[PDB]
Amino acid sequence: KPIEIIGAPFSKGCPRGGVEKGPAALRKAGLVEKLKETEYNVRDHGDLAFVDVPNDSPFQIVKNPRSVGKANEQLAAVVAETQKNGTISVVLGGDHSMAIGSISGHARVHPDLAVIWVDAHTDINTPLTTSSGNLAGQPVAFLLKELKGKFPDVPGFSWVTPAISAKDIVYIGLRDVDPGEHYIIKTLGIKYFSMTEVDKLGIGKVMEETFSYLLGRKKRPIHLSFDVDGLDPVFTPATGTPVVGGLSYREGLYITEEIYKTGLLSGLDIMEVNPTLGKTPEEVTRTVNTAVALTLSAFGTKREGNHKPETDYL
Numbered sequence: 091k092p093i094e095i096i097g098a099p100f101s102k103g104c105p106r107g108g109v110e111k112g113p114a115a116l117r118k119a120g121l122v123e124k125l126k127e128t129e130y131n132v133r134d135h136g137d138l139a140f141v142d143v144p145n146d147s148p149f150q151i152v153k154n155p156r157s158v159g160k161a162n163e164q165l166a167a168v169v170a171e172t173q174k175n176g177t178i179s180v181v182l183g184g185d186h187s188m189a190i191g192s193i194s195g196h197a198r199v200h201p202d203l204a205v206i207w208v209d210a211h212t213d214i215n216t217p218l219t220t221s222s223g224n225l226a227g228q229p230v231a232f233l234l235k236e237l238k239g240k241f242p243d244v245p246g247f248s249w250v251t252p253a254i255s256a257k258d259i260v261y262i263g264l265r266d267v268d269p270g271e272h273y274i275i276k277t278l279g280i281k282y283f284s285m286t287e288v289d290k291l292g293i294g295k296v297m298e299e300t301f302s303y304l305l306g307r308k309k310r311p312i313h314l315s316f317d318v319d320g321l322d323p324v325f326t327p328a329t330g331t332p333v334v335g336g337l338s339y340r341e342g343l344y345i346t347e348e349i350y351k352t353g354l355l356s357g358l359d360i361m362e363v364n365p366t367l368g369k370t371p372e373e374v375t376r377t378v379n380t381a382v383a384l385t386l387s388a389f390g391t392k393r394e395g396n397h398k399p400e401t402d403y404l
């Protein structure tokens with residue numbers, strides 16, 4: 091099964107800049123080369139070039155609506171294209187607003203996909219509930235069928251068509267949810283494992299329940315959207331919205347190892363690595379290293395070890 095790396099150096103999803111440098115930082119560590127050592131064939135699509143929309147005025151409180159909408163429409167096309175050729179798409183973030191295009195394009199080919207969203211945040215604010223207007227905090231609102239018509243049509247997103255229902259997504263790692271967002275996830279009956287549930291059950295039981303919920307009735311493609319801020323800031327400090335009390339490095343790898351074992355990974359997003367936000371060079375190395383480790387883990391690298399078949403090592 092082939093892999094296609096797609097860079098999304100974009101940061102208009104938030105006011106802070108820097109996350110657009112994420113793809114470069116990840117590639118610098120040798121991510122592409124390391125992936126080629128797994129049992130997957132790897133193709134690098136390179137980084138997408140995003141055309142900035144001039145005079146991109148704010149739609150009400152929403153910032154950079156047209157630019158974000160355009161970047162995501164382009165990403166959606168690329169991902170849909172790769173999915174059509176039966177390859178696994180891997181999007182290297184910039185900001186999480188890019189999940190709109192990544193998941194939308196993925197859903198065009200696999201409408202029955204299930205989403206596992208690892209994040210400290212729900213990123214489900216709507217243009218009407220957001221207090222900042224940052225689209226990086228509203229991705230899920232543009233993807234859910236249940237929220238269609240719950241907010242005004244935003245300039246640059248008419249191409250969007252709600253990909254999944256609130257019942258096809260599972261959140262893991264939540265600990266910084268706005269009131270409006272909490273109201274939404276409760277009202278919509280969305281399945282989630284906040285840090286409270288992770289502490290209660292243990293990451294082992296969390297994954298067990300996550301798969302039983304999403305795959306119990308039918309096996310289907312999995313789209314893993316991973317926000318590095320889902321892990322505690324002591325592991326992934328170089329990110330824009332760090333929140334204390336997060337998933338450990340170990341828990342993060344456990345998630346990816348279990349997802350690899352399902353053999354259902356169809357799409358993956360590695361988002362929010364902002365190289366300009368490390369307080370030191372090492373904080374960046376630390377963040378990039380775990381983002382890289384998570385990616386390789388999603389593709390077969392196991393902590394117990396690995397070895398190539400049909401090879402008598404002795």
Ligand SMILES: [Mn+2]
Pocket residue numbers: 186209211213226317
């Ligand atoms: Mn996020």
Ligand SMILES: [Mn+2]
Pocket residue numbers: 209210211317319320331
């Ligand atoms: Mn986040």
